[PDB]
Amino acid sequence: VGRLIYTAGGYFRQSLSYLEAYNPSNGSWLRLADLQVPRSGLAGCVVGGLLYAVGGRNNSPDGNTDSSALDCYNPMTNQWSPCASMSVPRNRIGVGVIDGHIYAVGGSHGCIHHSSVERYEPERDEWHLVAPMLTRRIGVGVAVLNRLLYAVGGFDGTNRLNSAECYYPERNEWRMITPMNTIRSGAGVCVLHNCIYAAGGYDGQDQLNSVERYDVETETWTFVAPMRHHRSALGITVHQGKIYVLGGYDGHTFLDSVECYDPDSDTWSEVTRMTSGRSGVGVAVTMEP
Ligand SMILES: O=C(COc1ccccc1)NC1CCCCC1
């Protein structure tokens, strides 16, 4: 009991500093302490009950600055604290957590498209580079299942990608997995039961409502019910066995829609609206303040 869906940052006209938390048990939203620096294209994650905001870019009136930052929000204090910065700025980053360690994957720095990957140790407040991916990927979706890290889709600067790869920590090695059926960058990628889901994104021509899932045993990708709304640069998380997608861009509107996927019925429903439409958020779940 008591867990909220936290959304940090995002983009609407400029990068945003908002931190807001949704309570699925009562439909309420809380506005919490703003990020110290506005950021879009970031990722969120949780370790030890603390919320982390990783990477991104500050698109502001005065400039566009890619972020190497890691910042930590403690729901007990409603305060953000800086942590050690990454080796490199990473906008349009993907993040996953393995056994209490944060992996920062890919992303962009100016015209540079990273294949590099680094790992944060919260107790030591240190980052260290690990093996790079086999592919340069920005707008990459990342998720962790069974202590293996998956990097899904993205953009290498020339083509959006249907490819995906898996990192095996004990060997510090990446291997390609079966590619998705659809090219996607800026998809929401998460884990639910024994599958990696890729929802939405941009294929180079259109924002997508399709959703497909990779079964890590059978190595297949299967489409599930599509979302009601096409969206790229959406936030995603999982809570109590359901997927939540937040915001994004549909080619017309920065969406405020939050949809929820029930795997038992293979259906999506609209569960709430964010307080304002935005794309490029970071999202994670932890205890309420
Ligand atoms: O939301 C963002 C930044 O975060 C992104 C995250 C993943 C992929 C792409 C971007 N930029 C918006 C600019 C205006 C057009 C819609 C995307």
With contact defined as beta carbons under 8 Å apart, do 248 and 279 qualify? yes
The residues, any chain, with a CB within 8 Å of residue 210's CB and separated by 6 or more, are 182, 200, 223, 226
CA distance 50 to 107: 23
Q: In which residue are the tokens 């060997």 written? A: 171
| Ligand 1 geometric centre to CA of 76 (Å) | 31
CB 155 within 8 A of CB 139: yes
DSSP per position, 91-129: BS-EEEEETTEEEEE--EETTEE---EEEEETTTTEEEE
Of 117, 124, 121, give the one whose Cα is nearest residue 99. 121
Question: Look-up: residue for tokens 């996607």?
Answer: 184
Residue 174 Cβ inside 6 Å of ligand 1? The answer reads: no
> Furthest-apart CA pair in the chain: how many Å?
49
Resolution to 1 decimal place, in Å: 1.1
**Cβ(138) – ligand 1 distance below 6 Å:** no
Q: Whose CA is nearest to atom 13 of ligand 1?
A: 11
Is residue 40 within 8 Å of 57, Cβ to Cβ? yes
Strands (E) located in 188-280: 188-192, 195-199, 211-215, 220-224, 235-239, 242-246, 257-262, 267-273
From residue 33, give the alpha-carbon distance in Å to each of 45, 75, 108, 282, 283.
17, 10, 27, 15, 15
- How close is the Cα of 232 to the center of ligand 1, in Å? 7
Residue 139 near residue 92, CB atoms below 8 Å: yes
Distance CA 3, CA 287 (A): 4
- The domains found in the chain, sorted by start residue, are 2-289 (2.120.10.80)
Among 7, 15, 16, 40, say which to mutate for ligand 1: greatest number of ligand atoms within 8 Å of CB.
Answer: 40
Query: Does ligand 1 lie within 6 Å of residue 40's CB atom?
Result: yes
| Chain position carrying tokens 């920005």 | 138
229 touches 245 (CB < 8 A): no
Q: What region does 41 belong to: left with phi over 0, alpha with psi -120 to 50, or beta?
A: left
- What is the DSSP track for 2-24? -EEEEEE--EESEE---EEEEET
Which of 132, 142, 138, 177 shows the shortest CA–CA distance to 155? 138
Phi-psi region of 134 (alpha: psi -120 to 50; beta: other; left: phi over 0): alpha
247 lines ligand 1 (CB under 6 A): no
Query: Whose CA is closest to 33, among 11, 4, 8, 59?
Result: 8
Kindly calculate the radius of gyration of the chain based on its CA atoms and give it in whole angstroms: 17
Residue 171, phi then psi, degrees to nearest 5: -110, 0
Measured in Å, residue 20 CA sits from the centre of ligand 1 at: 19
Tally the residues of the chain. 289
Q: What angle do CA 285, 286, 289 make, to 5 degrees?
A: 130
Rounded-to-integer distance, Cα 83 and Cα 251, Å: 35
Name the residue with tokens 């349009």.
92
